[PDB]
Scaffold this motif. Structure first.
Motif, PDB file in Angstrom:
ATOM      1  N   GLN A  93       0.552  -1.262  -0.165  1.00 45.44           N
ATOM      2  CA  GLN A  93      -0.095   0.309  -0.271  1.00 45.44           C
ATOM      3  C   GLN A  93       0.675   1.460  -0.188  1.00 45.44           C
ATOM      4  N   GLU A  94       2.252   1.088   0.264  1.00 44.64           N
ATOM      5  CA  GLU A  94       2.871   2.105   0.384  1.00 44.64           C
ATOM      6  C   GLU A  94       3.900   2.764  -0.581  1.00 44.64           C
ATOM      7  N   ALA A  95       3.182   1.531  -2.102  1.00 46.36           N
ATOM      8  CA  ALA A  95       3.819   2.398  -3.239  1.00 46.36           C
ATOM      9  C   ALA A  95       3.144   3.383  -3.108  1.00 46.36           C
ATOM     10  N   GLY A  96       3.800   4.514  -4.184  1.00 41.00           N
ATOM     11  CA  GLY A  96       3.534   5.868  -4.627  1.00 41.00           C
ATOM     12  C   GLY A  96       3.294   6.957  -3.446  1.00 41.00           C
ATOM     13  N   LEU A  97       3.423   6.076  -1.995  1.00 41.19           N
ATOM     14  CA  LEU A  97       3.029   7.034  -1.002  1.00 41.19           C
ATOM     15  C   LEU A  97       3.990   8.174  -1.007  1.00 41.19           C
ATOM     16  N   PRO A 124       5.598  10.590  -3.239  1.00 43.60           N
ATOM     17  CA  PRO A 124       5.042  11.651  -3.948  1.00 43.60           C
ATOM     18  C   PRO A 124       3.875  12.195  -4.051  1.00 43.60           C
ATOM     19  N   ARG A 125       2.569  11.275  -3.837  1.00 40.63           N
ATOM     20  CA  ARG A 125       2.019  11.683  -2.750  1.00 40.63           C
ATOM     21  C   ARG A 125       1.736  12.654  -1.567  1.00 40.63           C
ATOM     22  N   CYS A 133       3.410  15.403  -3.180  1.00 39.23           N
ATOM     23  CA  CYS A 133       2.625  16.599  -3.638  1.00 39.23           C
ATOM     24  C   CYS A 133       1.658  17.778  -2.973  1.00 39.23           C
ATOM     25  N   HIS A 163      13.504  13.504  -4.987  1.00 39.62           N
ATOM     26  CA  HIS A 163      13.189  11.762  -5.092  1.00 39.62           C
ATOM     27  C   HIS A 163      13.965  10.957  -6.321  1.00 39.62           C
ATOM     28  N   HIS A 170      14.299   6.877  -6.097  1.00 40.42           N
ATOM     29  CA  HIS A 170      13.837   5.728  -5.787  1.00 40.42           C
ATOM     30  C   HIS A 170      14.460   4.668  -6.461  1.00 40.42           C
ATOM     31  N   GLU A 188      12.592   4.502  -1.582  1.00 42.17           N
ATOM     32  CA  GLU A 188      11.801   4.832  -2.100  1.00 42.17           C
ATOM     33  C   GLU A 188      12.285   6.740  -0.033  1.00 42.17           C
ATOM     34  N   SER A 200      12.975  10.996   0.134  1.00 40.56           N
ATOM     35  CA  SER A 200      13.192  11.992  -0.629  1.00 40.56           C
ATOM     36  C   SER A 200      14.012  13.052   0.832  1.00 40.56           C
TER      37      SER A 200
END
Ligand SMILES: Nc1nc2c([nH]c(=O)n2[C@H]2C[C@H](O)[C@@H](COP(=O)(O)OP(=O)(O)OP(=O)(O)O)O2)c(=O)[nH]1
Ligand SMILES: [Mn+2]
Ligand SMILES: [Mn+2]
Length: 329
Positions: A205-209, A211-212, A215, A228, A230, A233, A235
């Motif tokens: 569920q943390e996938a692409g969290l 960047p969200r 944002c 970022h 990657h 993951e 920053s």
């Protein structure tokens, strides 16, 4: 006193700040000259003094302590006898140390870059700004905000940043958690940055969290820089922290780990740097396992240890559990 920093408690506040500071200045200088062994030796010796129950006021207290060679002893002796060590004051006064300290403390500048710059005749921050072609965007962001980034991050900054990071990750993904890591988890009242480890109890569920989350933080004017990467993951950011009237730039590391790796990531990112180094050397040399921030690998069996907690990792390594505030090696 055990040999490895991970076998012994090193509390936040200890009794020999002046002495270890001096040995850490020498470690740091050794590091600046690419002398890794010397760094480690000075660093280990410094953490020995941090682990002592009493202030070292006589050299007789230094007799018979491990990792504590003649060089470190001599430094401590001069400090005890004359209130200062000449090798330490020489480093402290040297343009080379001062400059390297200046450059390496800029966001995104490691030793190699600092040294290069030194060798090319750069000394001041204004020199770097006269040569912007020489700087990555990260380093430019570090220079633009250097004053704020040299201002110690306080607990109250951490609380405010944790709140906005929690809001943004809760908004981005319900159930997702934010764990304060790094020095602030170890009890420090100040720091160079704030480290956050982000995960979710459901693996994947943390996938692409990130960047969200980014944002959302960005949308609120809270982000001055982020990069970022990657490996987790992650920053490494500069936040615009609002304050009464003012604002200040603050370094924040956001790291996302999948929950299966979370214990290892927490252990690794909590530090201290020396504690972790010591724990990884211990695991390798004493137990034949490779510890990193992603797992604990058995290279003979080709297996990875499943951990639900940091306690599990310690237990699996044959070590008594040390809470974060006792990992200040
Ligand atoms: N696995 C991994 N660990 C890292 C990275 N960067 C990084 O600082 N750490 C670990 C090293 C330390 O064990 C821990 C503390 O990091 P830090 O540089 O923020 O130092 P700190 O919080 O202890 O102290 P402070 O100077 O921020 O107050 O985080 C990285 O890129 N990968
Ligand atoms: Mn930190
Ligand atoms: Mn950090």
């Amino acid at each position: 006193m055990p040999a490895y920093a991970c076998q012994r408690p090193t509390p936040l506040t200890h009794h020999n700040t002046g002495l270890s500071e001096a040995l850490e200045i020498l470690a740091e200088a050794a590091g600046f000259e690419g002398s890794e062994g010397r760094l480690l030796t000075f660093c280990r010796a410094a953490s020995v003094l941090k682990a002592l129950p009493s202030p070292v006021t006589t050299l007789s207290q230094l007799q018979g302590l491990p990792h504590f060679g003649e060089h470190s002893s001599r430094v401590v002796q001069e400090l005890l006898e004359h209130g200062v060590c000449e090798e330490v004051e020489r480093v402290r006064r040297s343009e080379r140390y001062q400059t390297m300290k200046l450059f390496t403390q800029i966001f995104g500048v490691g030793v190699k870059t600092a040294d290069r710059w030194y060798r090319e005749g750069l000394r001041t921050l204004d020199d770097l700004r006269e040569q912007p072609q020489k700087l990555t965007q990260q380093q430019k962001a570090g220079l633009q905000h250097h004053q704020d980034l040299s201002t110690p991050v306080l607990r109250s900054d951490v609380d405010a940043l944790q709140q906005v990071v929690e809001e943004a990750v809760g908004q981005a993904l319900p159930g997702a958690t934010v764990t304060l890591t790094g020095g602030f988890r170890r009890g420090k009242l100040q720091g160079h940055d704030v480290d956050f480890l982000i995960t979710h109890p459901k693996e994947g569920q943390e996938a692409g969290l990130l960047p969200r989350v980014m944002c959302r933080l960005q949308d609120q004017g809270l982000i001055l820089y982020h990069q970022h990467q990657h490996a987790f993951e992650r920053s490494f950011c500069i936040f615009r922290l609002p304050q009464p009237g003012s604002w200040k730039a603050v370094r924040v590391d956001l790291v996302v780990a999948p929950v299966s790796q979370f214990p290892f990531a927490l252990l690794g990112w909590t530090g201290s740097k020396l504690f972790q180094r010591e724990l990884r050397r211990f695991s390798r040399k004493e137990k034949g396992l490779w510890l990193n921030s992603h797992g604990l690998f058995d290279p003979e069996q080709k297996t990875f240890f499943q951990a639900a907690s940091e306690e599990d990792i310690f237990r699996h390594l044959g070590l008594e559990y040390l809470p974060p505030e006792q990992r200040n090696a």
